[PDB]
């Protein structure tokens, strides 16, 4: 495994390359998490080792969200959702990549989608989780946005290992985002839309599917999830990823 | 004057820093470069005062600068959107914070897309013959901005690369609609300039209908049938004077 900081258009982004003619899997997490909180559980599951063995994986920590990140200056003009997507091309450029298979959650899904829409030749397909195309302690907000031994473990990592000021900026940015202007101008690659039943973001994920092409977009509403697919049922999701990548011309 | 190549997100862009608080960033139209498109304005006499007080940065789109090597065959030329993602890197190279943009046809579209993505880096935009929607080389160019000219026709042939120009033009025509509606719209003052009896009067007005009028002003030049900077640069040099004043700078 190797980690690095990539100087991009709008500051640095921490990345974690970890894996083996095949696109690279680029992940972008949600607000309130980093790549360890959001994907390390998923990508260490057994039904994913095969992907990990056949594919290269690149985990992107949004600006200031990596473990033990220094606070940005006061008044920092934090990159908007659009500005966060313009940073992705530089990632590929740093490793001589040509295309990636993106996987995003909450804010990551929005960013990756905006990045596919700007540079569609660099994206083979997107896995979008809980995407939304539109006086509380921070650990309370985070838990209340995406929702047990899990809840406390996430509140516990948010506090000790992450920076409160940086997280505020990132969250304040995602909420001032604009609508993806998409019409069934739309995605030019296959999409995998994943949400759980009785989950906070079902209507939002369904609204995004209504504006996408059904020929190459598939919806998957897991029954016993109601929150984050990689938390509730990562196993069922690890196979969902298998079937999506296969259809494009790649081997799990 | 000093010129440089700026390595950006999507390859290099040639720039020409030349001047002396915001910086004036210029972007040309299809069929031109900064010499064909802005040198008339910025060497005009009624503009010297601006030239004296401001720093100017002229951007030549990839492959449009004088004597540019041909891109490889099959080159995926940056789209209009990808051409806007390149501008932040320009400011980043010279420690800039905001600029006053001036664009023409394709330049106006690019800068507008750049202001919409990074509105804190633009104090105001001068958009000329902007369109927010979608044969020998010199003839193609002339029919886009007119409906003596020979000075432009000869420069297309002798001084610039024909293949690069094709790619640039092929991109401008595959552009999409700007996500703008008068109340998601521009968050800075805009100066929309088009001539009377000009190919892009209806299009330039369509852009103003989607902009905020409190800070947007439209300008229909009376006897301008092509490029405002060619026909009546004086009328435009005074329009530019007043635009910068209203923002808090003393041209
Ligand atoms: Cl007006």
From Swiss-Prot, chain A:
Recorded superkingdom: Eukaryota
GO BP, one annotated term: mast cell activation
Entry's induction text: By homocysteine, 2-mercaptoethanol, tunicamycin in endothelial cells. Induced approximately 20-fold during in vitro differentiation of the colon carcinoma cell lines HT-29-D4 and Caco-2. Induced by oxidative stress in colon cancers. Decreased expression in colon adenomas and adenocarcinomas. Induced by nickel compounds in all tested cell lines. The primary signal for its induction is an elevation of free intracellular calcium ion caused by nickel ion exposure. Okadaic acid, a serine/threonine phosphatase inhibitor, induced its expression more rapidly and more efficiently than nickel.
Keyword annotations from UniProtKB, A to Z: Acetylation, Cell membrane, Charcot-Marie-Tooth disease, Cytoplasm, Cytoskeleton, Membrane, Microtubule, Neurodegeneration, Neuropathy, Nucleus, Phosphoprotein, Repeat
Subcellular location: Cytoplasm, Cytosol; Cytoplasm, Cytoskeleton, Microtubule organizing center, Centrosome; Nucleus; Cell membrane
Assigned GO CC terms: adherens junction; centrosome; cytoplasm; cytosol; extracellular exosome; microtubule; microtubule cytoskeleton; nucleus
Family that this chain belongs to: Belongs to the NDRG family.
Tissue-specificity statement: Ubiquitous; expressed most prominently in placental membranes and prostate, kidney, small intestine, and ovary tissues. Also expressed in heart, brain, skeletal muscle, lung, liver and pancreas. Low levels in peripheral blood leukocytes and in tissues of the immune system. Expressed mainly in epithelial cells. Also found in Schwann cells of peripheral neurons. Reduced expression in adenocarcinomas compared to normal tissues. In colon, prostate and placental membranes, the cells that border the lumen show the highest expression.
GO molecular-function term, one example from the UniProt record: gamma-tubulin binding
Disease: Charcot-Marie-Tooth disease, demyelinating, type 4D: A recessive demyelinating form of Charcot-Marie-Tooth disease, a disorder of the peripheral nervous system, characterized by progressive weakness and atrophy, initially of the peroneal muscles and later of the distal muscles of the arms. Charcot-Marie-Tooth disease is classified in two main groups on the basis of electrophysiologic properties and histopathology: primary peripheral demyelinating neuropathies (designated CMT1 when they are dominantly inherited) and primary peripheral axonal neuropathies (CMT2).
General function of this protein: Stress-responsive protein involved in hormone responses, cell growth, and differentiation. Acts as a tumor suppressor in many cell types. Necessary but not sufficient for p53/TP53-mediated caspase activation and apoptosis. Has a role in cell trafficking, notably of the Schwann cell, and is necessary for the maintenance and development of the peripheral nerve myelin sheath. Required for vesicular recycling of CDH1 and TF. May also function in lipid trafficking. Protects cells from spindle disruption damage. Functions in p53/TP53-dependent mitotic spindle checkpoint.
Protein name (database record): Protein NDRG1
Organism: Homo sapiens
Binding partners and assembly: Interacts with RAB4A (membrane-bound form); the interaction involves NDRG1 in vesicular recycling of CDH1.
Modified how: Under stress conditions, phosphorylated in the C-terminal on many serine and threonine residues. Phosphorylated in vitro by PKA. Phosphorylation enhanced by increased intracellular cAMP levels. Homocysteine induces dephosphorylation. Phosphorylation by SGK1 is cell cycle dependent.
């Amino acid at each position: 495994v190797q980690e690095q900081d990539i100087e991009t258009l709008h500051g640095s982004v921490h990345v974690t390359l970890c894996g083996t003619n095949r696109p690279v899997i680029l992940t972008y997490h949600d607000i309130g998490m980093n790549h360890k909180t959001c994907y390390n559980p998923l990508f260490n599951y057994e039904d994913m080792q095969e992907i990990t063995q056949h594919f290269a994986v690149c985990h992107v920590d949004a600006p200031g969200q990596q473990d033990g990140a220094a606070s940005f200056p006061a008044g920092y003009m934090y990159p908007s959702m659009d500005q966060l997507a313009e940073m992705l091309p530089g990632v590929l450029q740093q490793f001589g990549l040509k295309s990636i298979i993106g996987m995003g959650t909450g804010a990551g899904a929005y960013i990756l989608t905006r990045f596919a829409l700007n540079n569609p030749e660099m994206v083979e397909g997107l896995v979008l989780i809980n995407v939304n195309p539109c006086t509380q302690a921070l650990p309370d907000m985070v838990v209340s946005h995406l929702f047990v031994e899990v809840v406390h473990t996430y509140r516990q990592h948010i506090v000790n290992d992450m920076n409160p000021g940086n997280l505020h900026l990132f969250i304040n940015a995602y909420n001032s985002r604009r609508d993806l202007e998409i019409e069934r101008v739309t995605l030019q690659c296959p999409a995998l839309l994943v949400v759980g039943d009785s989950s906070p973001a079902v209507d939002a994920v369904v609204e995004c599917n209504s504006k996408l092409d059904p020929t190459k977009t598939t919806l998957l509403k897991m029954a016993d999830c109601g929150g984050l697919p990689q938390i509730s049922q990562p196993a069922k999701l690890a196979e969902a990823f298998k079937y999506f990548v296969q259809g494009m011309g790649y081997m799990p």
